[PDB]
Structures are given as C-alpha cells and as structure tokens.
Symmetry: C2
Subunit: 219 residues, 2 copies
Amino acid sequence: ITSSPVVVALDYDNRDKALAFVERIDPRDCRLKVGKEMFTLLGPQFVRDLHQRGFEVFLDLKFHDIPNTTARAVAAAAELGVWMVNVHASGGARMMTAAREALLPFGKEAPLLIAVTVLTSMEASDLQDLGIMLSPADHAAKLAALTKRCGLDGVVCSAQEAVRFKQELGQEFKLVTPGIRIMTPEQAQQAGVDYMVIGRPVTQSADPVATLASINASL
Amino acid sequence: ITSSPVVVALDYDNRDKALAFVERIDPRDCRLKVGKEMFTLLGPQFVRDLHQRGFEVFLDLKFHDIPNTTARAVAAAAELGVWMVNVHASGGARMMTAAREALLPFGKEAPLLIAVTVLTSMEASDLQDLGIMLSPADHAAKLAALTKRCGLDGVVCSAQEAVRFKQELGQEFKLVTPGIIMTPEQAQQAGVDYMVIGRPVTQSADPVATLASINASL
C-alpha cells in the first residue's frame, strides 16, 4: 500500500496503451484514477486488471442519480474493491446520505466516499444558466458543508481552497485535488491536500517514472 | 425495430436474472434501459449481449462531468452502438454542447442525446439545500429550455409536464418519462415519446403479459 498522496489519472482511450504506462510504474509510488472514458470503454474488468497489478484505484465516475440508484452504484464499486469512489453533491443530501449508508456495512473494506462540489470547468456564467448566483467558490463551499453534514469522507477541492476548507470543515475531512485547473504538489500538500490527482504531467512525460519519482521526492 | 414507445428498465443485480427476463420478451415489443447498477457490475459487454439479442438500448448513466470528459464518454456510448444516452443538464451549457459535438461524426447512427433536468426524486426541500428556490417543475423547465438551446434531442420529463413541454419546446423535442399518476396511454396522449417502465413489468406476476397489456393500450 503506497504512502504517496499522488493518484495518477488514466485517461487513455486504449487498454494496451494504458497498461503499457501502468507496467512502467509501481504500486508503491502512486494510486490510479479510472474515469468515465476508460470505464465506459472497458467496464469493471479494467479496474480488476489494475487491482491484479497491485494498484489501489480511485473510481472517478461522479455518480449523480436518485438516492436508491446512487446507493446501489456505490455498493457496486465497494464490491469491486475500489479504494475511493465519488458522487455529486448536487444530487442532494438524501442521495449523499443514501450512498454513505450503503457503504457502512462494508466496514473496513468500504471505499472512501468523496463528493464533487463545483466542477473545475464551471465559471459564474455557467452557473447562472442553472440559477446559481453564488460564485463557483462560494457554491462549492456550500456544497462541501452539505457533504460534511451528510457524513461523507471529503470533497474534491482545488488546492487554492484547501486552507479555507481545512479551517472551516476540519483536519479530518479529506480534500482531493482534481488534477485540472499556482502550487507545486509540495505546496498543495502544505495547504492540507490529502490526495492529489495528477494526469498529463506524469502520463505525457518522456520519463513518467522519473517524473513521478521527482514529484514523490518533494512530498 | 420496435414500434412500441416502452423502454423496460433492467435493474437486476445479477446477469443471469436479467438475461432470463430478456429471453422471455422480444425486441419488437420494447427497448431496454441499462442503468448505473448493471453497468458498474457488468460493463459494456452487457450492452453488447443485449444488442446480440436484437434489442435497442437506452444507456442511462446520467453523465455529469467537465465538457471534454462528458464528450468522450458520450462518444464511447456511440461507439458501443446504443440507441439513447443521457447527460445531466446540471452540467451546464458548455458540457451539453460538447456532448452534442461528440456525436456529430456518428451522424444518423448516433444515439439520441437526452438530458436529465431535475431527478424524479428531488423535492423543493432537496433543491433548497443547493441554493435552488424554484419548484422542481420550474427548475426542470429552465433546464429543459437550456437543453433545447444547446441542440440536444430531448429531456427526461414526467408525464405531468409533457403538455407544457410540447407547447413550449415543440413537437420535435423528445420527452422520455423515467418511470420512477398518469397511465402509459395518457402519457402518450400528453405527448410523451418514450416511456421507461421498470418494476411494474419486471416484478409483475407475468412480465410478458404485463408488457402486452401496456402495449395494447398504446
């Protein structure tokens, strides 16, 4: 089990390429994030393929559904054995509560349950189309407070908001950075970030092993 | 291809139970919906299995992500060959436009691209926690108009709102009910294009006979 806070994003469109990157690195050095594109293409067998190679996996599908269905989906991810799974806080308190409750029987096998608040791509003009007039940051803080109240394990949060969030929501509440947009990984850790998703800077480097080693050497 | 507007929801937790039901019915009598639970359990191969049996499939995963990621996921669904796929309108206009653009190279073989507006399960009190002070129906209408403006094919909409939506958004804009009261016949009369039906069929005493009773009314 790695002691690195890095989670490397697998955003490949091809199984062979993805696994050609994953064999080059080492489960001791990072965890892996499987997102919508890879999961729609390959399904849970790809996650099993990563587990069999010794990696722990953040299943980043951002479930957003009615409470029962979200509950069943999170339980399915728990049965798949993943380390972390997320939901949209925009699904509301009852949906978040249903997901948390679906995971409690899993006890120590339960994945970490993290909520997306505001996506990184959302600016004020995107939000106003939807009736949201709080700034992205204020809306995110609001949704993060709702997530903590529902008992979830943490939120996805930019490093720029991590000191604010640790002060308001507490040291125990986990912050995961999304890997898209300044702070170095070391500075993001200093801010209180618990897990940092890193994508292209590692997967698109000429030496992803040395890149990842250099990131870890700083943390 | 089917003339029925019915889409039966496959919310089994086991492949064998799901396929036993699918073996009893026929693709001429309905299409099928594959949601989060079955897809997280079985993946795209389950969709392929349904296609091999002749069914058209609504892949109901409610993608809600940054624009580029939602676009790649919708393209993956198109590659899989599904009949309908959905996204959350709550993902915003740029996300929906990205999904629309991702399907253009698939042309007429693209899935229908439908947006979830407000989930059936959301009441006013659930929306208020999010800062939304409109009624579910009024918020849904706002998100539906946004979906039309972005050029998507339609929305998931209760039958109780279909008359309003056909008047305001036009006949060409597709309405899909979620099946989560109005009868299927009344829903069709109100303007519903496709109706999702789940446990009323799959947990009935005789699902083939239930489905035939529904189709006879339509």
